């Protein structure tokens, strides 16, 4: 009993939030190449038998509603949950098209507390976003 | 009887705490490119942490930035696996 039970009828949802275009008022640049990522992830998780849902250019309000709604679905027949976030960010924060969302707010919808259908099941958050402004100069081998 | 409410979460970050993350406008982000390649090659063979460790190595060794701006040129990236999982995760069977 050292591995998660992954033989439920469904592997589970893979939610892909692909934020490429941001409201001009935010002053954030477009994230060229993120569509390549979103398509790569869609195909990859399709081959793993995840129910992939690709969402594009979501406001901060839409991200929170999406996470809330998804956490309230029936996950009883699903082995796991995956959420992929592709956006601008900083430490602890990912950006909707019009403003930031705390990562904690997103993940709290799925806490073993608030989403009983996923208690004991692996909840995977894959986050392509900045975590700050430091640069890694590397070192020679 | 109870488990922690924070148990069974895994956060696969593209980059280390405090750092920029790199995206290529033609190929996609370094992290997602590498993640998909390693899932493709190893999801039927390795446990997820070992898959994500191959992702770390791929990003760390095969990518380095090219920029006309010296400040952003020749930079590197390491992803950051944050595991509160309590079991091994295999995608097969």
């Amino acid at each position: 009993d050292n591995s998660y039970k992954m033989d439920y009828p469904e592997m589970g949802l893979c939610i892909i939030i692909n934020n490429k275009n941001f409201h001009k008022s935010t002053g954030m640049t477009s994230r060229s190449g993120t569509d390549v990522d979103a398509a790569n992830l869609r195909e990859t998780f399709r081959n793993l038998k995840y129910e992939v849902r690709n969402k594009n250019d979501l406001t901060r309000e839409e991200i929170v509603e999406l996470m809330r709604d998804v956490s309230k679905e029936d996950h009883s027949k699903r082995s796991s949950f995956v959420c992929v976030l592709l956006s601008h960010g900083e430490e602890g924060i990912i950006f909707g098209t019009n403003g930031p969302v705390d990562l904690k707010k997103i993940t709290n919808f799925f806490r073993g507390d608030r989403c009983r259908a996923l208690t004991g099941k692996p909840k995977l958050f894959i986050i392509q976003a900045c975590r700050g402004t430091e640069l890694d100069c590397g070192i020679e081998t | 009887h109870k488990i922690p409410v924070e148990a069974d979460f895994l956060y696969a970050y593209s980059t280390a705490p405090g750092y920029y993350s790199w995206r290529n406008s033609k190929d996609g982000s370094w992290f997602i490119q590498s993640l998909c390649a390693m899932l493709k090659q190893y999801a039927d063979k390795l446990e997820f942490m070992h898959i994500l460790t191959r992702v770390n190595r791929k990003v760390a060794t095969e990518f380095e930035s090219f920029s006309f701006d010296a400040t952003f040129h020749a930079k590197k990236q390491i992803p950051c696996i944050v595991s509160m999982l309590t079991k091994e995760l295999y995608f097969y069977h």
């Binding site: 601008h88 900045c130 | 993350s21 790199w22 090219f66 920029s67 952003f72």
Partner: peptide, 4 residues
């Protein structure tokens, strides 16, 4: 290559 761009930071993002």
């Amino acid at each position: 290559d761009e930071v993002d």
